[PDB]
Symmetry: D2
Subunit: 333 residues, 4 copies
């Protein structure tokens, strides 16, 4: 009778399909939408759900993505302020809450964003008890800890985007100096995604050539080439971009899509992401900060043990102390 | 104690992989390996299993693929003569059996390849009772029927690669004449993957312009442009390529990867593939042949009802009669 | 002496890059950045230049993209307010200018954006005399005409993004009703990217089945299924999304990346884009509006002639009249 | 008058198109066709030309690829025994000649394959004087030297596929031991693509952790974990695969596509490929062997200088001496 009934003959009985690689993005602001477009561009989701408290903005973002469906391979894009829309997600990316004002530390956002997370996180696990949560909201290390405590998920299923972005920036800036692709320039930023991050100069290399072996002063204040300035540029990068355009989003969206790719393709690639590091490098408390971690379909399955220089371990311990001083006073977790 | 124990600190205490996007290719001949490399190139499997009777060849192919892992996103590639290696496959591609000699009809392979399938199909469903089977071995329409009977699987989970390849050839040949990309030149080959195929000239179009409306003689024997010769070239293509290089493999490997993409990405794209067409176009028996079908993560869920011209319906019925003449005499299914 | 001199031994004594697959995006607003991220995600440029009048915002966007380099395959990302940065671009995407307020016609933007284009287009061709220009700013059909006049380029090198986006929206909405992928649901929106667009109901098809042959009332006011409402939703879509989120950007960014892919891959795929249609369907003036066009590495090399129904031709002529009424009064082009 | 003339209205004059990223594959054997399918799969060629002395096999391979065009983004696939078909190639991949029989050294193929190259290489440069040549035929290091002498091309435009494959195998075997993706396991095989290859144990690392710092005996005969066996497995791999399936092809096809991607995308990624190493590591003659090299659109533009252990330098010099002993006895280059 209907055009659809004239055109389409069933072979199978119409039955509810459960998606196999659903992704939710919580928060459809600058970061959440950069994450969404990068996930859709890399064909990483068979279903994409969006949540926000701004109902009109949310519906607009959902419709704009839906209009691009012809160019994508994501057959279902949905959005609602209600967390029921997020059911059966494999990965939930949390970008909701407040961002830095100009010259504001990420650590100054802690009380506001803890209050946002207190109501969101229990709803995420209610509807997707088997998900991995990727925390992006700042300060990302503290809010990964908070998400672990609120969610009751195992450690391997609560990941902070952490220093995957800082390390991308570091590798870009070193690769630009050397005239090579960042993928061929190896270097790790660890610890806090923020001012106390640690540059592991001792592991920086190109084709397995230690650059600190070529320039032993690399990373010190007594270096005629002032490589230390590259780590200062990594630390200052968010502040500089926020002064120019108000926020950052494109690089973090690609960084989050890189983490999702490793997990949904089950690759066991190593990324510097935020995890619980008690018992590593003499850290005595449940600090979350970035170390090199193996990521696959289970989540964050292992941490790489490193031989660090004394000044590197000292900076990592200082970063841990900086974060623990905030974590220890958090209430009702 | 081991280097691995020194380097890698567990976060998850468990290392077992849950079966997920596993594909098996049965047969490691020219077609099975083209299927395998196209599945790996398009990142369509997290686990690829190869099964075949030829143990040395199978191990060599497995090792050669494993050596390219750095360039791929498939973390597990395995191979064995025993079907236990195929356990918990979501899709199984069947390419094993005899192939055409020069000038040989695909229909002449039926007794030999039915005997191969009486062995193989029960082993597939023993180890993957919840799989989708894509049949590629020839004659593909008859062997799709045979696989359906032997497997006990529902219709929507047994698919013959069918005329997805014939249609690709048809679109290439018409697009070459018009100077456009085959993706912009729409045309359907239906029925037997073989000599009795149907060119649906009444549906051939560019930008929704019916080419038969522009040239009503298109596909008739009274056409000065002789468009009918294009269908003759589609029918003869396998024989011409077999005469020149001995077999065909690259285009069918890409065609199979196209079908898998629609299913694993859950897209509900329409392909001309082999399904059970009883009750369509006056067909009274359980004939399998190619019609436009919707493919998604459930398998083959719908068929498109078409308005055909009399000469199109007549060739489709002739195709069904040709195939049923062989099907009706099959024993012990 | 330097770490770079210690590490890197020249084989080639020269480092300059020969200009090749360079793309400029003019405008770093919502649309320019969606275009930029989609071009980078699809690896469509070896060099991306951003040009804009807002120097701080431009530098911030350039830095944010640069920080994602590790995740991309574009080795050079540059930005300046001076058009010297755009030199030797193969493709220039123009997204600069004013956009619609809530409820505002795209045609109300004409005087403002003609003033923008009178500055921008001469600067583009000064620095890239051999480029293809893709016009995105609204009203896109009028500004494609203005760009043709100001640039002195041949017709095949000046393209309006046009109805590629309207057609994607149309195919999304029809595919959603039928439960299929938009890539399997064929349908064309022609004429103005705006209120006077034409839905070619006579060409709408699935697997070469004309849907108007199944439902002759499709696209008329006397249709119990009211398929006409789908064309109304296409026309209203920009206004609805602007009401909800303030602007549109994701779908047009993907649409522009689709056009660039056809051209840089030299594919001769057909897209409904804005071109000079004098002499077509009795149009007597140099009107620009969308028809199905072949796109390849030369640009826009052909238009598809269509057999249209009387109501489709009537709307196309009305669309042409609507645009010519504005074009005829333009001065100093 | 013709259907094409009714359907397609010219905007531009029909003009001969010069491809911008044409690739030729010389030899359509097991390696040449693995190269071709990997190039087509990664969308690296707007035109693909095939050359072989076997005219029928060549035409059949061309047709089988053409039949897959709908699934590809390569609008022109051509093939001929005449090198005029290769004109205006950016990259020419040479796979032609004889391969190893079972247990045969690659070095034993040198006189036969030099005789093939003496005829081929002058014709390649005649028709594509601006190309990069990637040598794959064995013994690859000596034939890269021979191709340099015969071609008269600059060093940076003559590249041997070299140890890109050996290093992929090495990284796969180490990554399998550690349970990580090969892309996260860093290790270099240098020198001859063959029995005298050098494992740079001192540069092997995961996340910038030197594995030889964890196990100082790594690569010695006095190692309880016998990591040296992994290098033996790399050396023996081609022989083992040749014993099982007769040849190798899939891994080298993906390795060649990786080198092409770096060059056509202008990335300046580092690969261990065969280049002229006179003046490096006390090598006094025009030896070609693999070192880490930067690859971009210019070709092989730099070599990475490494700090190697004494035993590693000794092995590299022994590899150079092994290759020079063959190069010095070659006639009429
Ligand atoms: N980890 C990293 O590397 C980076 C983190 N960030 C962080 O990402 C977060 C988001 O930044 P933007 O997207 O630029 O901010 P934004 O202001 O553009 O968007 C934030 C969104 O969160 C929504 N939201 C607020 N409260 C909510 C609640 N209770 N439930 C649901 N949605 C809620 C808002 O309505 C808004 O749409 C910030 O915390 C920022 O500091 C930003 C850049 C990089
Ligand atoms: N549906 C389509 O469009 C196409 C179908 N084909 C069909 O694909 C099949 C495979 O072709 P190729 O790979 O070229 O053949 P091939 O000879 O290269 O490989 C045949 C494979 O099946 C195995 N096999 C052969 N005889 C067997 C037996 N008696 N029992 C168990 N395993 C056996 C072999 O060990 C080998 O792995 C043929 O039936 C051929 O007609 C070929 C091309 C296109
Ligand atoms: N063709 C299509 O399908 C679509 C077209 N558009 C059009 O794209 C254009 C850009 O929209 P958005 O990016 O959302 O706007 P936006 O306000 O976010 O960005 C506009 C950009 O143009 C620059 N610009 C503004 N006024 C200028 C002037 N007087 N001179 C020079 N540069 C100037 C701004 O600095 C900024 O870079 C608008 O004309 C809009 O109507 C919007 C969406 C889809
Ligand atoms: N560098 C590497 O890592 C690897 C190198 N190889 C080498 O690749 C080469 C090709 O191996 P396969 O493809 O397996 O051999 P194959 O025997 O399958 O194909 C070689 C092709 O070269 C053609 N040919 C012979 N002389 C020719 C000439 N004068 N002009 C044009 N074409 C000519 C033959 O007709 C044949 O089609 C061998 O030298 C082999 O050792 C193989 C694997 C990996
Ligand atoms: C002679 C001696 C040593 C070599 C090979 N050098 C490999 C050494 C190496 C380092 C340096 N590790 C530092 C060393 C100081 C102790 C504290 C921190 C760890 N980083 C890498 C990153 C990647 C690869 C290797 C390395 C060659 C010749
Ligand atoms: C019997 C008669 C005819 C057929 C199949 N006919 C397919 C025809 C067709 C149309 C309809 N064209 C219109 C109709 C006339 C009004 C003026 C404009 C042109 N659109 C398509 C889009 C795609 C493919 C085909 C078509 C089958 C059986």
């Amino acid at each position: 009778a209907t055009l659809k009934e004239k055109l389409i003959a069933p072979v199978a009985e119409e039955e509810a399909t459960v998606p196999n690689n659903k992704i939710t993005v919580v928060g459809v602001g600058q970061v959440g939408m950069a994450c969404a477009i990068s996930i859709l561009g890399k064909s990483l989701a068979d279903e994409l759900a969006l949540v926000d408290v701004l109902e009109d903005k949310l519906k607009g973002e959902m419709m704009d993505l839906q209009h691009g469906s012809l160019f994508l391979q994501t057959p279902k894009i949905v959005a609602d302020k209600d967390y029921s829309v997020t059911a059966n997600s494999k990965i939930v990316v949390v970008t909701a809450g407040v961002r830095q004002q100009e010259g504001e530390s990420r650590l100054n956002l802690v009380q506001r964003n803890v209050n946002v997370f207190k109501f969101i996180i229990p709803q995420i696990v209610k509807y997707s008890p088997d998900c991995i949560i990727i925390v992006v909201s700042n300060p990302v290390d503290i809010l990964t800890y908070v998400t672990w405590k609120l969610s009751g998920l195992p450690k391997h299923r609560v990941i902070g985007s952490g220093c995957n972005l800082d390390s991308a920036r570091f590798r870009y800036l070193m690769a630009e100096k050397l005239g090579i692709h960042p993928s061929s320039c190896h270097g790790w930023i660890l610890g806090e995604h923020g001012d106390s991050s640690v540059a592991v100069w001792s592991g920086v290399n190109v084709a397995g050539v230690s650059l600190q072996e070529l320039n032993p002063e690399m990373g010190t204040d007594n270096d005629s080439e002032n490589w230390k300035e590259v780590h200062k540029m990594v630390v200052e990068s968010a502040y500089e971009v926020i002064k120019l355009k108000g926020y950052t989003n494109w690089a973090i969206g690609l960084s989050v899509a890189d983490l999702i790719e490793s997990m949904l393709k089950n690759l066991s690639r190593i990324h510097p992401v935020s995890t619980m590091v008690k018992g590593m490098y003499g850290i005595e408390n449940e600090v979350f900060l970035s170390l090199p971690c193996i990521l696959n379909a289970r989540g964050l399955t292992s941490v790489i043990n490193q031989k660090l220089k004394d000044d590197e371990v000292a900076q990592l311990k200082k970063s841990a102390d900086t974060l623990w001083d905030i974590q220890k006073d958090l209430k009702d977790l």
